Amino acid sequence: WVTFYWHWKHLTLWQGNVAQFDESSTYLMGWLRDYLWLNSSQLINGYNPFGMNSLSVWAWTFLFGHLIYATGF
Amino acid sequence: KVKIAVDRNPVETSFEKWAKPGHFSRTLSKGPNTTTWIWNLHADAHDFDSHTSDLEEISRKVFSAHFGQLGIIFIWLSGMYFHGARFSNYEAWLSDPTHIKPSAQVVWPIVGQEILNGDVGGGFQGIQITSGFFQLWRASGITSELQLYTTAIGGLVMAAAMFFAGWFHYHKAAPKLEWFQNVESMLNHHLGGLLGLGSLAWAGHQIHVSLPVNKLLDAGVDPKEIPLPHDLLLNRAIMADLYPSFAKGIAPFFTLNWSEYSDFLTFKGGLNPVTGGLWLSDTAHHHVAIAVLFLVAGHMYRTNWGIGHSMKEILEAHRGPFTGEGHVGLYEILTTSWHAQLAINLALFGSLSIIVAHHMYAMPPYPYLATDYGTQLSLFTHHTWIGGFCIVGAGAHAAIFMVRDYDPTNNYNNLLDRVIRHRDAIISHLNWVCIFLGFHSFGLYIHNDTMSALGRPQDMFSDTAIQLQPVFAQWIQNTHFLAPQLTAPNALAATSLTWGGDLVAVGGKVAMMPISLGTSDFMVHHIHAFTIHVTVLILLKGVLFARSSRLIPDKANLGFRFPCDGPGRGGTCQVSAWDHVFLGLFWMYNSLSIVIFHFSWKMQSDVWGTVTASGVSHITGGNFAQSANTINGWLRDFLWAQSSQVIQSYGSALSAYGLIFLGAHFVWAFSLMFLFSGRGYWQELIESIVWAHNKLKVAPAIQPRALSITQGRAVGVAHYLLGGIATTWSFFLARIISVG
Amino acid sequence: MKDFTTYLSTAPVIATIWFTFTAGLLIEINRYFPDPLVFSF
Amino acid sequence: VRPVWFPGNPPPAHLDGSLAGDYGFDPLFLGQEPQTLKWYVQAELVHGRFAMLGAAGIILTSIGAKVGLGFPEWYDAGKVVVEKNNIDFPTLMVIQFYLMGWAETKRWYDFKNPGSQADGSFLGFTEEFKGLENGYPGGRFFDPMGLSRGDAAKYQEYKQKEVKNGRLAMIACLGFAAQYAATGKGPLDNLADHLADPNHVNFATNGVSNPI
Amino acid sequence: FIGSSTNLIMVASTTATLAAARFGLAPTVKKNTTAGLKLVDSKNSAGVISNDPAGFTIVDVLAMGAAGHGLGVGIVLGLKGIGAL
Amino acid sequence: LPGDFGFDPLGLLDPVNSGGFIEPKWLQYSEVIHARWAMLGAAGCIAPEVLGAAGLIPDATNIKWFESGVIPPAGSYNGYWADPYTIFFVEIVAMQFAELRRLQDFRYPGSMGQQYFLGLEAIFKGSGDAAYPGGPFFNLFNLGKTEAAMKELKLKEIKNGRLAMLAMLGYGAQAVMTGKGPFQNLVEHLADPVNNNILTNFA
Ligand code: CLA
Ligand code: CLA
Ligand code: CLA
Ligand code: CLA
Ligand code: CLA
Ligand SMILES: CC1=C[C@H](O)CC(C)(C)[C@H]1/C=C/C(C)=C/C=C/C(C)=C/C=C/C=C(C)/C=C/C=C(C)/C=C/C1=C(C)C[C@H](O)CC1(C)C
Ligand code: SF4
**Is residue B69 lining ligand 1, measured as CB closer than 6 Å?**
no
Q: Is B368 helix (H, G, I), strand (E, B) or coil?
A: coil
| Residue with CA at minimum distance from ligand 4 atom 38 | B670
Enumerate residues lining ligand 6, CB below 6 A.
F 8-10, 12, 34, 37-38, 41, 44-45, 65, 68, 70, 165, 168-169
| Residue with CA at minimum distance from ligand 3 atom 30 | B435
| Residue pair B307/E27 in contact by the 8 Å Cβ criterion | yes
D3 touching F (Cβ < 8 Å)? yes
Number of domains in chain C: 1
| Resolution at which this structure was determined, Å | 3.4
CATH number at residue C16: 1.20.5.510
CA distance B601 to B596: 9
Residue C3 to residue B16, Cβ atoms within 8 A: yes
User: What one-character DSSP code corresponds to residue B228?
Assistant: P
Compute CA distances B731 → B114, B198, B657, B663, E60, whole Å. 22, 38, 7, 12, 63
For residue D3, is it within any domain? no
- Each residue of B20-55: b (16+ CB within 10 Å) or e? ebbebeeebeeebeebbbebbeebbeeebbbbeeeb
CA distance D191 to D115: 47
CA A30 centroid distance within chain: 13
User: What one-character DSSP code corresponds to residue B706?
Assistant: P
| Residue pair B93/B134 in contact by the 8 Å Cβ criterion | yes
CA distance B81 to B83: 6
Question: Which range of residues forms the domain containing residue B413?
Answer: 1-740
Helices (H), ranges, B126-250: 133-140, 145-167, 177-180, 183-189, 198-205, 211-219, 229-234, 236-242
CA distance D188 to D163: 25
Amino acid at position B270, single letter: G
| Residue with CA at minimum distance from ligand 5 atom 53 | B201
The residues facing E40 across adjacent strands are E32
- If you compute the radius of gyration of chain F from its CA atoms, what whole number of angstroms results? 21
| Residue pair F15/F27 in contact by the 8 Å Cβ criterion | no
CA distance A17 to E20: 97
CA B113 centroid distance within chain: 32
| Residue pair B485/B501 in contact by the 8 Å Cβ criterion | no
Q: Is B152 helix (H, G, I), strand (E, B) or coil?
A: helix
The residue ranges of every structural domain in chain F are 24-191
Closest CA to B588 of B394, B356, B344, B343: B394
User: How many of the other CB atoms lie within 10 Å of CB of B643?
Assistant: 18
CA F82 centroid distance within chain: 25
Nearest CB partner across the interface for F20, out of B6, B230, B249: B6
CATH number at residue D157: 1.10.3460.10
CA distance B335 to B179: 12
Closest CA to F114 of F130, F101, F129, F103: F101
Dihedral sign of CA atoms B479, B485, B486, B490 in order: positive
Detail the DSSP E strand segments found in B186-318: none
Helices (H), ranges, B454-550: 471-486, 519-544
Cα angle B324, B330, B331 (rounded to 5 degrees) comes to 135
Enumerate long-range contacts of B31-34, CB under 8 Å, 24 or more apart: B32/B702, B33/B702, B33/B703, B34/B702, B34/B703, B34/B704, B34/B705
User: How many of the other CB atoms lie within 10 Å of CB of E7?
Assistant: 14
User: What one-character DSSP code corresponds to residue B273?
Assistant: T
CA distance F191 to F179: 18
| Residue pair F32/F157 in contact by the 8 Å Cβ criterion | yes
Q: Is B510 helix (H, G, I), strand (E, B) or coil?
A: strand
Cα angle C22, C26, C32 (rounded to 5 degrees) comes to 145
> Which residues of D belong to the annotated binding site for chlorophyll b?
5, 49, 75, 78-79, 96
User: What one-character DSSP code corresponds to residue B7?
Assistant: E
Chains B and F touch (3+ CB pairs under 8 A): yes
User: How many of the other CB atoms lie within 10 Å of CB of A27?
Assistant: 11
* Element containing residue A4 per DSSP (H, E): helix A2-15
Compute CA distances B319 → B327, D86, E71, whole Å. 7, 102, 32
Cα angle D170, D174, D175 (rounded to 5 degrees) comes to 115
Closest-lying ligand 4 atom to the alpha carbon of residue B666? 1
- Breaks following residues of chain B (C-to-N distance > 2.5 Å): none
CA distance B679 to B716: 13
Contacting residues for E38 by C-beta, under 8 A, at least 6 apart: none
CA distance E22 to E54: 6
Dihedral sign of CA atoms B547, B552, B557, B562 in order: negative
Q: Which ligand is nearest to the CA of B264?
A: 2
Contacting residues for F104 by C-beta, under 8 A, at least 6 apart: D6, D7, D8, F111, F112
Biggest CA pair distance of chain F: 62
Residue B306 to residue E73, Cβ atoms within 8 A: no
**Is residue B666 lining ligand 5, measured as CB closer than 6 Å?**
no
CA distance D9 to B689: 60
Q: Residue E40 phi/psi, 5° resolution?
A: -125, 165
**Is residue B239 lining ligand 2, measured as CB closer than 6 Å?**
yes
**B contact test, residue of A23, A27, A28, A29 with most B CBs within 10 A:** A29
Q: Is A7 assigned to a binding site?
A: no
Number of domains in chain D: 1
The residues facing E48 across adjacent strands are none
Dihedral sign of CA atoms B522, B528, B531, B535 in order: negative
CA distance B52 to B61: 11
Q: Which ligand is nearest to the CA of B679?
A: 7
User: What one-character DSSP code corresponds to residue B512?
Assistant: E
Alpha-carbon gap: B239 to the closest alpha carbon of chain F (Å): 15
From chain F, the residues in CB contact with D202 under 8 A are 86
Closest CA to B202 of B80, B270, B289: B289
Enumerate long-range contacts of A3-8, CB under 8 Å, 24 or more apart: A4/A31, A4/A35, A8/A35
B16 touching C (Cβ < 8 Å)? yes
* Element containing residue B610 per DSSP (H, E): strand B610-611
Closest CA to B569 of B556, B550, B586: B550
**Is residue B63 lining ligand 1, measured as CB closer than 6 Å?**
yes
Cα angle F190, F194, F195 (rounded to 5 degrees) comes to 85
CA distance B151 to B83: 11
User: How many of the other CB atoms lie within 10 Å of CB of E65?
Assistant: 15
Which CATH number is correct for F24-191, 1.10.3460.10, 2.30.110.10, 3.30.460.10, 1.20.1730.10? 1.10.3460.10
From chain A, the residues in CB contact with B452 under 8 A are 47, 49, 52
- Each residue of E31-63: b (16+ CB within 10 Å) or e? bbeeeeeeeeebeeebebeeeeeeebbebbeeb
Pocket test for ligand 3, best of B442, B461, B717 (most atoms within 8 A of CB): B442
Question: Which range of residues forms the domain containing residue D145?
Answer: 34-196
CA distance C33 to C36: 7
CA F131 centroid distance within chain: 14
Residues of C with CB under 8 A from a CB of D: 1-2
User: How many of the other CB atoms lie within 10 Å of CB of B169?
Assistant: 18
Residue F83 to residue D7, Cβ atoms within 8 A: no
Angle at which helices B55-86 and B133-140 cross, to 10° = 90
For residue D211, is it within any domain? no
| Residue pair B596/A28 in contact by the 8 Å Cβ criterion | no
CA distance B422 to B415: 11
Closest CA to B529 of B470, B480, B478: B470
How close is the Cα of B148 to the center of ligand 5, in Å?
Answer: 27
DSSP string, B420-462: HHTHHHHHHHHHHHHHHHHHHHHHHHHHHHHHHHTT-GGGS-S
Question: Which range of residues forms the domain containing residue C8?
Answer: 1-41
CA distance B532 to B530: 5
Q: Is B126 helix (H, G, I), strand (E, B) or coil?
A: strand
Amino acid at position B259, single letter: S
Question: According to the entry, how was the structure determined?
Answer: cryo-EM
Q: Residue A52 phi/psi, 5° resolution?
A: -160, 165
Q: Three-class SS string for chain D?
A: CCCCCCCCCCCCCCCCCCCCCCCCCCCCCCCCCHHHHHHHHHHHHHHHHHHHHHHHHHHHHHHHHHCCCCCCCCCCHHHHHHHHCCCCHHHHHHHHHHHHHHHHHHHHHHHHCCCCHHHCCCCCCCCCCCCCECCECCCCCCCCCCCCCCCHHHHHHHHHHHHHHHHHHHHHHHHHHHHHHHHCCCHHHHHHHHHHCCCCCCHHHCCCCCCC
F7 touching E (Cβ < 8 Å)? no
Q: Are strands B118-119 and B509-512 parallel, antiparallel or unpaired?
A: unpaired
Angle at which helices B709-739 and B373-400 cross, to 10° = 160
Residue E49 to residue F9, Cβ atoms within 8 A: no
CA distance B547 to B577: 9
Nearest CB partner across the interface for B21, out of C4, C10, C30: C10
Residues of F with CB under 8 A from a CB of B: 11-12, 14, 17-20, 22, 73-74, 199, 202-203
Helices (H), ranges, B567-708: 577-606, 624-627, 631-633, 644-647, 655-676, 679-695
| Residue pair B407/B556 in contact by the 8 Å Cβ criterion | no
How close is the Cα of B675 to the center of ligand 7, in Å?
Answer: 14
Q: Residue E65 phi/psi, 5° resolution?
A: -65, -45
Residue F81 to residue D205, Cβ atoms within 8 A: no
